[PDB]
Amino acid sequence: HMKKLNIALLGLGTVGSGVVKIIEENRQQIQDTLNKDIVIKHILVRDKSKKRPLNISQYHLTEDVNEILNDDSLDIIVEVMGGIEPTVDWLRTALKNKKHVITANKDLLAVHLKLLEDLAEENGVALKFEAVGGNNISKFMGILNGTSNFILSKMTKEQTTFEEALDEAKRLGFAEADPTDDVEGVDAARKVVITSYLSFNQVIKLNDVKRRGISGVTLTDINVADQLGYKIKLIGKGIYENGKVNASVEPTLIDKKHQLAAVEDEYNAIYVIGDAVGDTMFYGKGAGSLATGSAVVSDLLNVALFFLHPPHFELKTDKTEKSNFFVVVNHVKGSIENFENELKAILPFHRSLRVANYDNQSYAAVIVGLESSPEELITKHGYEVDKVYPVEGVL
Amino acid sequence: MKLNIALLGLGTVGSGVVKIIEENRQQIQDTLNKDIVIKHILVRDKSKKRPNISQYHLTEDVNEILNDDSLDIIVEVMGGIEPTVDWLRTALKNKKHVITANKDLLAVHLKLLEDLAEENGVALKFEASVGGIPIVNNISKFMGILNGTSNFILSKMTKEQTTFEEALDEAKRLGFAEADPTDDVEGVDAARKVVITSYLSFNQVIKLNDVKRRGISGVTLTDINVADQLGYKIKLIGKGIYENGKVNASVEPTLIDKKHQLAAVEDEYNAIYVIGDAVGDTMFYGKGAGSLATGSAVVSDLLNVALFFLTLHFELKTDKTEKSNFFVVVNHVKGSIENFENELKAILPFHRSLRVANYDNQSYAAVIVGLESSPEELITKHGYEVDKVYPVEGVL
Incomplete structure (x- = not known):
């Protein structure tokens, strides 16, 4: 009844080591519950010579990604390596070869996610992204x-x-x-x-x-x-x-x-x-290595339950539209009331204005309900704008 | 291409489920190569109104749904424990998957339905809120x-x-x-x-x-x-x-x-x-999930159940690679707040910290950090009137 789920890891930092340890400590539960034996068949690393813990040394380590990409027995590639180049190509190749991909690559942007999601769907395989x-x-x-x-x-x-x-x-x-x-x-x-x-x-x-x-x-x-x-x-x-x-x-x-x-x-x-x-x-909090590893494994198990895209x-x-701004001006002469009155005179329509002391010859204003930044306008009226925050x- | 379902109930949540199924029917057939057929909708009174007049079979007899062996999934959005829960027990026993958004179910009911579902090899999906409450x-x-x-x-x-x-x-x-x-x-x-x-x-x-x-x-x-x-x-x-x-x-x-x-x-x-x-x-x-959000969750659960079934760490x-803290209000206290504070220091068991505040005429409040339980009875037994204690x- 037990099918083998053959996977490979691309990378082995803190996140990759966590994935491995998490798979190891749950191997019986994954076997005895979901009728699948997860085999970490290859781990790609930058240097296979480095000194590593004893558990890691029993997996097949390689420095050649082609060994993973050409292994037709693999069901799922887990990528935790990072980088856009050449990483993204690697994953493109995997998807084209009908391999499911799970990536926790922190450097991927929407362009890359879209291109991989489509390519995955095109080839009838999962792509799971963790962030x-x-x-x-x-x-x-x-x-x-x-x-x-x-x-x-x-x-x-x-x-x-x-x-x-x-x-x-x-x-x-x-x-x-x-x-x-x-x-x-x-x-x-x-x-x-x-x-x-x-x-x-x-x-x-x-x-x-x-x-x-x-x-x-x-x-x-x-x-x-x-x-x-x-x-x-x-x-x-x-x-x-x-x-x-x-x-x-x-x-x-x-x-x-x-x-x-x-x-x-x-x-x-x-x-x-x-x-x-x-x-x-x-x-x-921002996810740690252990939490990201944990997410990778559950996604691994979800994909393994497969044997779908997209929304409602x-x-x-x-x-059954406006913007608000905090404006700091300096080298202002005269009083805060004068500053305030000048803004009331120069601003386009808005809902409210309040002004505060900021420093020597420096005032700040919070303005609610403008269509856009009053920065240029204030500058053109002879104020030095230090900065504007929304x-x-x-x- | 047919997924036959029935709804038990049709308030705002049920109407949302229907309308969501309708406006996504083309996608779903593509996204599952199956046609969702809302075959029955149970309502308590067919003659009430206004959610509009529609094309589905409305019934007031739940047996018509429970005895229809062509059904694959029962969606329950009716509420109530009795006899709603028995209805779902019957459905599960008849190998029907159940998706429920019933706001009255308690843990006893969820547990009995989950087990009964697993026992009969069918899904039970439960929706709640205070977003669906898992949040696994x-x-x-x-x-x-x-x-x-x-x-x-x-x-x-x-x-x-x-x-x-x-x-x-x-x-x-x-x-x-x-x-x-x-x-x-x-x-x-x-x-x-x-x-x-x-x-x-x-x-x-x-x-x-x-x-x-x-x-x-x-x-x-x-x-x-x-x-x-x-x-x-x-x-x-x-x-x-x-x-x-x-x-x-x-x-x-x-x-x-x-x-x-x-x-x-x-x-x-x-x-x-x-x-x-x-x-x-x-x-x-x-806020509490709206009708539309709950309906939305029901339909995705409908589609998940449909894709599987083929089941389901x-x-x-x-x-x-804890103690408890208490806010205690005492009244009819004579003497000063410093004295009250000293009396509490003397009568409380060992604790981390104490602060006292004026509350009203001859009433003081204390925040006490690091007790194992409410000092209410203790403070009472020392002759003080405790008004109340909040954690x-x-x-x-």
């Missing part, structure tokens, strides 16, 4: 990078500079020694790309995500936001309006009563908005 | 705001500084509360969801009556404001803790630390906060 979280979504907003969020939390709670908070995040291992990918919003931008593809079924490029990191956020921004009733977060956002995805990652003031405002430290969250449903949010349309729904969660 | 191994504790109306009322009291009665009337006037709001206000609805959530989270069956339950009608604006100054909000929390083979489940007014993700959940929003392993805490937030990750959560 915990699974139509009518119009907007999502997320805190999608643990390190940046940890830093902003530490600045806010402990009243430290960005630089001090970054060093502390390094000391604790949240940040790497080159934390660029985190602090410049690149990681969050990649996730916005993926989330836009899953939410809207639209492919955008990484370069289409308007991106700004957190390294310019100061304690003054945080405290003035605070006084106005906001926290500062790095928000990855996608809005799907009239066939077009507008995607961004940037420092964003979030009203303190908004569910996102409470998401602190290394926690992440994705807040989802749709017609006509109420808003939803999922909250939790809900025009049964029938049977504002979310206004009621 | 390592869960030790969950805390939730599981009833919209009660949460709305507490939010209105807190934000607008009104009495419970005023907030309840406002909730009635807006339709959140019914004219008898007991199910909401006395925590019954939350308790039902604690039962279901405990069954899904721990695979343990508890009875509705095992949920220690207190509603919100005794929460006052004084409680809210004293809690606020102490650093807490007040919520109706449904909670399950799985310790040493035993589920302890409750629903009651609870002080929740303002930094806790649950403290921000306001108005009719709900949330389920899940605690586990070495993994981080997780939370799902949203917990991974084990084992591998390297305290999210303490760090």
Whole structure:
């Protein structure tokens, strides 16, 4: 009754080692329950000479991917190697050879996901992609990078500079020694790309995500936001309006009563908005190696239960736009009332305006209900604009 | 090409299932090479109305459905325990797959139907909400705001500084509360969801009556404001803790630390906060699933059942690589708050921390961290009048 499920792993870092150990510790349960014996037949590694733990040394290690791609006995390829090139081609080859693919490749973007999903369907095989979280979504907003969020939390709670908070995040291992990918919003931008593809079924490029990191956020921004009733977060956002995805990652003031405002430290969250449903949010940490490995194995077991694409349309729904901005200006002479009155005179129509002291000869304004950034307009009226952050969660 | 189904019930959820099946019928045939035929729909009264007039066979006789041996799947969206549960038992015994979105089922019922299904080699798919409640191994504790109306009322009291009665009337006037709001206000609805959530989270069956339950009608604006100054909000929390083979489940007014993700959940929003392993805490937030969302889940479960049938683990990750807190209100206390505080320090058993607050004339409140149980009886036996005790959560 027991069929063999022959698999190969491409890569063996922390995620790959976890997959192996998870398969090992559950081998009897997978055998005695689901009438299938999982055989890890090959593991591709960069160097087969390296010194490795005893359990790993009993698997067949190779440095030649063709050995895996040409092994016609394999049912499923698990890729945990990373990279776009040549990784994506490898997976294209596997799918063309009628091999199911499960990938936890952190470097894949929507373009790559789409091309693999189609190619998989074309060849009648599964493609499962891992990136915990699974139509009518119009907007999502997320805190999608643990390190940046940890830093902003530490600045806010402990009243430290960005630089001090970054060093502390390094000391604790949240940040790497080159934390660029985190602090410049690149990681969050990649996730916005993926989330836009899953939410809207639209492919955008990484370069289409308007991106700004957190390294310019100061304690003054945080405290003035605070006084106005906001926290500062790095928000990855996608809005799907009239066939077009507008995607961004940037420092964003979030009203303190908004569910996102409470998401602190290394926690992440994705807040989802749709017609006509109420808003939803999922909250939790960024997956670790063990959690990703765990997801790979369950997907392995799901695919093995196979022996299908794609979603529902809900025009049964029938049977039943603005932006907000935080603007910091400096080298301003005269009073805060004068600054305020000038803005009241120059701004196009909007719902509300409030102004605050920011620093010596520096004021900040929160403006709700504009059609677009007033930055250029304020600049043309002789103000030095230090910066503008979007504002979310206004009621 | 035919998948013959019957619906038991046709309210908003049933109408949504129908309309979703209709608008996707072309996809489904392609996406399964089979034609879904809604062959019967059971309604309690054919002569009622308005959801519109349609093309399906409506019946008032459930035996017509249960005896139709051409059926493959029964979709139940009727509600009720009796005789709804017996109907489903009959279907399963007759080798019919069952998909149910019945809001009245408790863990006892789910368990008996799951077993009976497996026994007869057919699917049983259950849909719930507070998103479908799985949300599928390592869960030790969950805390939730599981009833919209009660949460709305507490939010209105807190934000607008009104009495419970005023907030309840406002909730009635807006339709959140019914004219008898007991199910909401006395925590019954939350308790039902604690039962279901405990069954899904721990695979343990508890009875509705095992949920220690207190509603919100005794929460006052004084409680809210004293809690606020102490650093807490007040919520109706449904909670399950799985310790040493035993589920302890409750629903009651609870002080929740303002930094806790649950403290921000306001108005009719709900949330389920899940605690586990070495993994981080997780939370799902949203209103109760709407009819359209539940209908949507029913149809995908319909399609999954159809693809299989051909039938249907917990991974084990084992591998390297609690005390209670209480808010106690005492009244008819003579002497100062410092004296009260010293008296509590003398009479409490060993504990982590104590803070005291003014509550009213000759009344003090205390937040106590690190006790094994409510100090209410103890404080009483020392001659104090305890007004009430609320648990305290999210303490760090």
